[PDB]
Design an enzyme around this catalytic site. Structure first.
Site, mmCIF file in Angstrom:
data_model
loop_
_atom_site.group_PDB
_atom_site.id
_atom_site.type_symbol
_atom_site.label_atom_id
_atom_site.label_comp_id
_atom_site.label_asym_id
_atom_site.label_seq_id
_atom_site.Cartn_x
_atom_site.Cartn_y
_atom_site.Cartn_z
ATOM 1 N N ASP A 15 36.717 -52.211 -5.174
ATOM 2 C CA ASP A 15 36.887 -51.647 -6.506
ATOM 3 C C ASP A 15 37.354 -50.188 -6.484
ATOM 4 O OD1 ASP A 15 34.872 -51.664 -9.572
ATOM 5 O OD2 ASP A 15 36.918 -50.949 -9.161
ATOM 6 N N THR A 16 38.653 -49.994 -6.686
ATOM 7 C CA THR A 16 39.246 -48.659 -6.704
ATOM 8 C C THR A 16 38.808 -47.816 -7.915
ATOM 9 O OG1 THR A 16 41.273 -49.370 -7.842
ATOM 10 C CG2 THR A 16 41.232 -49.507 -5.415
ATOM 11 N N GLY A 17 38.235 -48.465 -8.933
ATOM 12 C CA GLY A 17 37.740 -47.761 -10.115
ATOM 13 C C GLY A 17 36.325 -47.220 -9.982
HETATM 14 C C1 LIG Z 1 34.547 -45.619 -15.508
HETATM 15 C C2 LIG Z 1 35.540 -46.537 -14.838
HETATM 16 C C3 LIG Z 1 35.008 -47.941 -14.586
HETATM 17 C C4 LIG Z 1 34.715 -48.670 -15.906
HETATM 18 C C5 LIG Z 1 33.799 -47.883 -13.641
HETATM 19 N N1 LIG Z 1 33.311 -49.251 -13.294
HETATM 20 C C6 LIG Z 1 34.114 -49.900 -12.236
HETATM 21 C C7 LIG Z 1 34.940 -51.034 -12.864
HETATM 22 O O1 LIG Z 1 35.910 -51.523 -11.926
HETATM 23 C C8 LIG Z 1 34.065 -52.179 -13.360
HETATM 24 C C9 LIG Z 1 33.471 -53.066 -12.250
HETATM 25 C C10 LIG Z 1 32.628 -54.182 -12.866
HETATM 26 C C11 LIG Z 1 33.088 -55.505 -12.829
HETATM 27 C C12 LIG Z 1 32.335 -56.539 -13.397
HETATM 28 C C13 LIG Z 1 31.118 -56.261 -14.005
HETATM 29 C C14 LIG Z 1 30.648 -54.952 -14.032
HETATM 30 C C15 LIG Z 1 31.404 -53.919 -13.470
HETATM 31 N N2 LIG Z 1 34.871 -53.037 -14.189
HETATM 32 C C16 LIG Z 1 34.679 -53.206 -15.490
HETATM 33 O O2 LIG Z 1 33.957 -52.516 -16.182
HETATM 34 C C17 LIG Z 1 35.351 -54.414 -16.067
HETATM 35 C C18 LIG Z 1 35.201 -55.653 -15.433
HETATM 36 C C19 LIG Z 1 35.828 -56.795 -15.926
HETATM 37 C C20 LIG Z 1 36.608 -56.687 -17.076
HETATM 38 C C21 LIG Z 1 36.748 -55.444 -17.700
HETATM 39 O O3 LIG Z 1 37.504 -55.311 -18.815
HETATM 40 C C22 LIG Z 1 36.127 -54.305 -17.186
HETATM 41 S S1 LIG Z 1 31.691 -49.335 -13.038
HETATM 42 O O4 LIG Z 1 31.420 -50.649 -12.598
HETATM 43 O O5 LIG Z 1 31.094 -49.014 -14.305
HETATM 44 C C23 LIG Z 1 31.148 -48.200 -11.918
HETATM 45 C C24 LIG Z 1 31.079 -48.442 -10.549
HETATM 46 C C25 LIG Z 1 30.626 -47.309 -9.849
HETATM 47 C C26 LIG Z 1 30.393 -46.264 -10.737
HETATM 48 C C27 LIG Z 1 29.910 -44.904 -10.334
HETATM 49 C C28 LIG Z 1 29.729 -43.861 -11.212
HETATM 50 C C29 LIG Z 1 29.296 -42.806 -10.406
HETATM 51 N N3 LIG Z 1 29.244 -43.204 -9.097
HETATM 52 O O6 LIG Z 1 29.635 -44.491 -9.070
HETATM 53 S S2 LIG Z 1 30.686 -46.590 -12.414
#
Ligand SMILES: CC[C@H](C)CN(C[C@@H](O)[C@H](Cc1ccccc1)NC(=O)c1cccc(O)c1)S(=O)(=O)c1ccc(-c2ccno2)s1
Lengths: 99, 99
Positions: free
Chosen positions: B25-27
């Site tokens: 997960d690059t996000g």
């Molecule tokens: C702020 C930027 C991002 C929202 C951060 N997240 C990483 C995402 O890739 C997230 C991954 C996801 C997938 C499925 C269920 C739940 C999450 N995708 C999603 O939220 C997602 C998934 C599927 C469909 C959709 O429309 C969105 S995240 O998951 O919220 C996140 C990961 C690490 C974080 C952090 C903050 C500080 N240190 O580390 S915040």
């Protein structure tokens, strides 16, 4: 380009003649942008992330140029913490993960 | 390998005696794993995404094997719906984005 991951992979996108910064997000199924105006018919949708579910507006067949690569597809507009480019458009611009 | 994004970029990871499927997960700034009772010191943190925040426990210098590649670093443990390999470990296994 090749993009390494020591920094957030933020890129400039162009959408509706506007320049925004968005995060290339391989963990997102969808492309989700912060509140903005887009023209045309939209559908109410709900999507789920790490903190639960939110309501978004679904716009179809919206052109976005991402780092100079053209996509046309679905953009969700709603309360995402940051603009994110998800897999629906990452595939269109030929983006892959490599290690 | 090269991983296309037609489907979720799930890979097998190992954390001690546990094998799990996790998103490359690059996000994600840091790695977030489903609830598990890891040994050692940790610190509480709140992390925010779509839907709001969850509370996690931050463990440092945890070894994780990702498709046979060795990584060691911060792991956030909490009530996430999916295991997430974040940039902190992606860099260590040589993972880049390419288009
Ligand atoms: C702020 C930027 C991002 C929202 C951060 N997240 C990483 C995402 O890739 C997230 C991954 C996801 C997938 C499925 C269920 C739940 C999450 N995708 C999603 O939220 C997602 C998934 C599927 C469909 C959709 O429309 C969105 S995240 O998951 O919220 C996140 C990961 C690490 C974080 C952090 C903050 C500080 N240190 O580390 S915040």
């Amino acid at each position: 380009p090749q993009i390494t991951l020591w920094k957030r992979p933020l890129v400039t996108i162009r959408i509706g003649g506007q320049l925004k910064e968005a995060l290339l997000d391989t963990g997102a199924d969808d492309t989700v942008l912060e509140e903005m105006n887009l023209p045309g018919k939209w559908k109410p949708k709900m999507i789920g992330g790490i903190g639960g579910f939110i309501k978004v507006r679904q716009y179809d067949q919206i052109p976005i140029e991402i780092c100079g690569h053209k996509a046309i597809g679905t953009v969700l507009v709603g309360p995402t913490p940051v603009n994110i480019i998800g897999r629906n458009l990452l595939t269109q611009i030929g983006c892959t993960l490599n290690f």
